[PDB]
Amino acid sequence: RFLKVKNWETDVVLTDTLHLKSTLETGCTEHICMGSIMLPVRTKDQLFPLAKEFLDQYYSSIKRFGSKAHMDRLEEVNKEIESTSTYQLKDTELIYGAKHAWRNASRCVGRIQWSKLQVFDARDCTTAHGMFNYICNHVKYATNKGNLRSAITIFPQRTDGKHDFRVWNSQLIRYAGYKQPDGSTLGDPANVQFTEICIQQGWKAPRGRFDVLPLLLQANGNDPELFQIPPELVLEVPIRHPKFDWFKDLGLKWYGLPAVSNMLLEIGGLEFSACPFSGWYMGTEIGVRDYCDNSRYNILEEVAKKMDLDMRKTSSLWKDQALVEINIAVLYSFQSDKVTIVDHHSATESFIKHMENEYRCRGGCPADWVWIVPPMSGSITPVFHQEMLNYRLTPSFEYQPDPWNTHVWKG
Amino acid sequence: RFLKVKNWETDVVLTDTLHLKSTLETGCTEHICMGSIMLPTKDQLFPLAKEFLDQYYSSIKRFGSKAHMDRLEEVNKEIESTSTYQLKDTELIYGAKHAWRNASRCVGRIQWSKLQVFDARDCTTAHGMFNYICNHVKYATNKGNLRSAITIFPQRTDGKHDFRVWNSQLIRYAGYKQPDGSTLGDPANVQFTEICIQQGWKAPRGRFDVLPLLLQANGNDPELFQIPPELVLEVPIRHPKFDWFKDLGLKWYGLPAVSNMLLEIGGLEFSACPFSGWYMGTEIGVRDYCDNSRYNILEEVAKKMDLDMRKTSSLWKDQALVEINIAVLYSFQSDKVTIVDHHSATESFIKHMENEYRCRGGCPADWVWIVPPMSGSITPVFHQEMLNYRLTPSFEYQPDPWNTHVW
Ligand code: HEM
Numbered sequence: 001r002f003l004k005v006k007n008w009e010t011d012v013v014l015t016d017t018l019h020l021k022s023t024l025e026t027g028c029t030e031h032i033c034m035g036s037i038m039l040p041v042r043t044k045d046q047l048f049p050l051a052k053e054f055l056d057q058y059y060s061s062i063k064r065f066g067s068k069a070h071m072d073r074l075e076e077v078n079k080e081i082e083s084t085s086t087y088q089l090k091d092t093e094l095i096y097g098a099k100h101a102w103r104n105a106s107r108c109v110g111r112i113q114w115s116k117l118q119v120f121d122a123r124d125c126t127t128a129h130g131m132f133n134y135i136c137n138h139v140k141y142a143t144n145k146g147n148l149r150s151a152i153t154i155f156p157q158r159t160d161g162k163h164d165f166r167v168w169n170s171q172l173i174r175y176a177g178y179k180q181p182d183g184s185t186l187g188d189p190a191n192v193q194f195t196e197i198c199i200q201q202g203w204k205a206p207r208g209r210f211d212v213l214p215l216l217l218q219a220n221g222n223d224p225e226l227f228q229i230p231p232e233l234v235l236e237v238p239i240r241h242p243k244f245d246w247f248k249d250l251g252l253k254w255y256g257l258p259a260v261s262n263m264l265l266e267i268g269g270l271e272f273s274a275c276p277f278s279g280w281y282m283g284t285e286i287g288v289r290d291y292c293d294n295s296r297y298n299i300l301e302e303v304a305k306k307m308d309l310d311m312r313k314t315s316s317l318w319k320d321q322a323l324v325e326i327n328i329a330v331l332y333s334f335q336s337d338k339v340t341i342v343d344h345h346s347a348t349e350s351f352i353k354h355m356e357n358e359y360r361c362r363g364g365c366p367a368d369w370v371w372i373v374p375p376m377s378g379s380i381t382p383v384f385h386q387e388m389l390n391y392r393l394t395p396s397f398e399y400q401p402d403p404w405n406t407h408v409w410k411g
Numbered sequence: 412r413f414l415k416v417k418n419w420e421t422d423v424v425l426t427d428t429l430h431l432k433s434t435l436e437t438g439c440t441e442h443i444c445m446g447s448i449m450l451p452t453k454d455q456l457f458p459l460a461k462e463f464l465d466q467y468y469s470s471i472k473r474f475g476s477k478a479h480m481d482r483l484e485e486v487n488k489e490i491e492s493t494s495t496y497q498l499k500d501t502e503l504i505y506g507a508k509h510a511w512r513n514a515s516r517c518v519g520r521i522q523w524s525k526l527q528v529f530d531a532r533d534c535t536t537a538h539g540m541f542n543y544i545c546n547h548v549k550y551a552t553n554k555g556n557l558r559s560a561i562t563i564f565p566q567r568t569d570g571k572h573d574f575r576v577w578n579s580q581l582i583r584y585a586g587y588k589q590p591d592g593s594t595l596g597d598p599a600n601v602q603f604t605e606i607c608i609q610q611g612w613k614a615p616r617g618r619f620d621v622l623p624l625l626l627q628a629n630g631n632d633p634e635l636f637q638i639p640p641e642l643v644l645e646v647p648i649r650h651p652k653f654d655w656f657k658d659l660g661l662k663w664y665g666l667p668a669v670s671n672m673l674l675e676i677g678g679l680e681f682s683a684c685p686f687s688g689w690y691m692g693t694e695i696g697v698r699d700y701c702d703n704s705r706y707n708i709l710e711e712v713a714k715k716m717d718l719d720m721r722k723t724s725s726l727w728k729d730q731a732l733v734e735i736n737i738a739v740l741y742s743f744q745s746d747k748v749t750i751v752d753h754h755s756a757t758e759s760f761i762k763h764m765e766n767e768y769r770c771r772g773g774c775p776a777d778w779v780w781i782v783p784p785m786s787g788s789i790t791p792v793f794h795q796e797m798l799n800y801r802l803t804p805s806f807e808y809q810p811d812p813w814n815t816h817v818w
Pocket residue numbers: 102105107108109110111113117150151152277278279280281282285342347371397
């Protein structure tokens with residue numbers, strides 16, 4: 001069966017046959033759409049099929065399907081599973097795997113880049129210290145002095161779910177949040193709970209508004225340990241505005257490298273609970289969400305004051321006005337410092353081209369509209385006008401619960 | 412069975428049970444989400460009738476009463492012999508108010524129970540239709556102090572005797588393609604604008620020409636009519652700081668009145684049922700003015716502001732978009748035409764959601780439509796999980812009449 005998606009601004013229609021190759025469920029039914037819901041120990045039994053599909057995909061992509069190297073590999077994985085209960089991916093399969101997980105990531109607008117991913121195989125890693133070293137190398141390689149390069153680091157896969165590798169941080173670089181007793185927060189509110197954990201594990205907190213948090217790291221199921229990323233490794237951009245000279249006096253900066261560390265990489269049935277990955281920022285991530293969410297740094301007001309806008313009635317659109325300035329400032333700052341960042345117009349347009357090309361070559365491109373559309377200026381980006389089809393392909397990045405909720409402390 | 416929706420900005424969690432009374436289908440499956448697609452018999456009718464009347468009688472606290480049962484019999488007998496049935500006025504009104512209540516794409520539902528319903532079921536001609544329409548337009552406009560209203564023409568019968576308003580709204584601007592290849596006026600109405608001319612309309616062929624109404628009664632060929640100009644309240648668009656803004660020559664009309672939908676109540680289809688409320692500022696300023704396939708004016712406004720349009724990374728479109736929208740809200744407010752800005756409206760819709768949750772057990776909502784097409788995440792609705800489902804009575808889309816009507 002074929003499915004059509006139309007762009008309402010250009011009238012381009014597209015035909016999706018790829019949704020056919022999908023099995024994981026959406027959270028949706030014929031009676032309810034959960035399209036806007038944020039979050040809607042494997043047996044040998046169900047492991048070989050998962051293996052087989054993956055290797056069928058892998059071998060098709062290299063144009064070797066049905067070959068002797070394809071069959072021998074099936075038979076070998078098959079044997080290794082019955083014998084050992086799991087199996088190891090060749091290097092080639094891991095690389096292909098991680099590329100495809102990104103490729104299939106429907107909430108990601110930056111996927112035009114999916115085929116350029118530096119994969120770092122950390123499956124020989126055994127300790128937290130080994131983790132730290134692997135991560136530092138990732139952060140230095142990916143930063144590249146501001147000329148950001150996409151990368152992922154993949155630690156050993158889950159075995160009995162009792163020996164998991166986990167990065168307790170939600171990102172490799174992120175600013176502390178500290179709840180004061182008067183109810184206010186100092187620094188990033190997103191990070192207060194994690195910050196407290198760090199502190200409880202013995203981190204001495206500078207307690208400022210932009211303190212880079214320590215890596216908290218779990219190897220082989222052992223309690224995690226704290227480590228400071230070398231400061232010279234953390235590239236940061238002080239935030240100024242091309243015409244508002246008081247803007248710098250707002251005391252703002254951000255880090256240049258976004259690197260998600262809390263998700264799970266599934267490939268051919270295997271689960272990698274530690275697989276930090278990094279690309280680069282679209283400006284709105286920082287200027288709209290990180291700075292302006294009410295539950296984040298929440299700077300709209302103080303920027304509004306400084307611009308002396310009529311703040312007395314919402315219909316002045318003073319909020320909308322401050323938001324654009326703040327976003328001009330973020331992009332201006334990054335560009336001036338020659339740190340890679342992309343604006344939301346350029347990013348969404350690229351993505352439309354990627355999506356169209358994906359339909360023509362692959363028969364589909366699963367996409368989550370709620371996520372692909374930027375959080376300001378929605379309809380003046382071409383994605384707003386693009387119908388999308390959202391479905392679940394593997395390999396994939398999945399959510400997993402916070403490890404402090406699951407972890408069994410050895411003390 | 413019972414579903415949770417969470418607001419991520421405030422942490423409030425709501426439990427939806429209303430979805431288990433969902434009837435219609437969504438387009439989605441376990442395997443695919445179609446959340447962002449725009450348009451995903453005697454025996455048939457009695458179930459629908461019964462289900463509507465049960466909720467109507469439960470709403471008036473008379474579920475199961477003799478009054479309830481008798482009406483179920485009376486409607487049942489009428490179907491059994493006539494093959495359709497007629498709604499009591501009280502049922503007509505409740506049905507309409509609830510069709511709005513259930514409209515998951517409408518951010519403005521906090522207003523739902525204050526709807527003036529005009530029963531035009533005794534109408535028989537397009538002249539009759541025009542007269543009902545003008546009285547609608549005048550009542551709802553109210554000299555700028557807009558009031559919500561729907562007018563309901565006679566329900567479909569054999570679907571060869573359909574009443575239809577061919578305009579997509581009562582009031583909208585014309586669209587002419589030109590030898591220039593460009594488009595003058597509203598390019599969204601270009602094709603209708605033709606059908607009108609193909610029907611005799613003398614287009615003044617300018618940029619903001621209020622289209623003629625094109626009305627079809629009892630399935631007949633439809634007929635042109637010019638709304639008395641004095642009935643069309645319009646706003647010239649100026650900016651509270653850019654004096655030059657007025658020079659752009661922009662105006663919009665005060666009354667949005669969706670005229671092409673189909674109202675379904677208790678299994679009965681009312682295919683002409685124009686309804687109207689009032690505008691959220693972004694509809695005009697963001698979509699109508701700046702959609703690249705609408706008036707697409709960002710290019711020219713950016714010029715007047717002398718912004719650096721050299722690179723997309725100056726956010727010049729974003730800068731302009733904001734001003735354009737300050738101007739619209741400003742114009743309407745200055746002239747005392749009712750209008751709501753996207754901040755105040757989404758705040759109200761969050762409050763409506765919470766009312767419906769504790770009062771009705773849920774509130775179907777389509778996040779993709781509810782989140783405004785500017786400043787999404789600074790409106791509270793961005794951070795609100797919504798569950799979308801299809802309850803009845805409802806408004807549905809229906810084919811354009813010209814693709815259908817036989818001459
Ligand atoms: C090349 C630069 C990239 C850009 C500009 C980009 C852009 C984005 C943005 C804006 C989001 C939404 C994030 C949010 O709102 O929190 C996102 C989500 C996501 N991106 Fe990309 N991305 C890039 C590279 C990558 C890479 C290298 C990966 C992994 C290999 C990736 C995988 C994902 C995933 C899995 C999500 C969804 C995260 C979630 O569900 O919370 N992206 N991306």
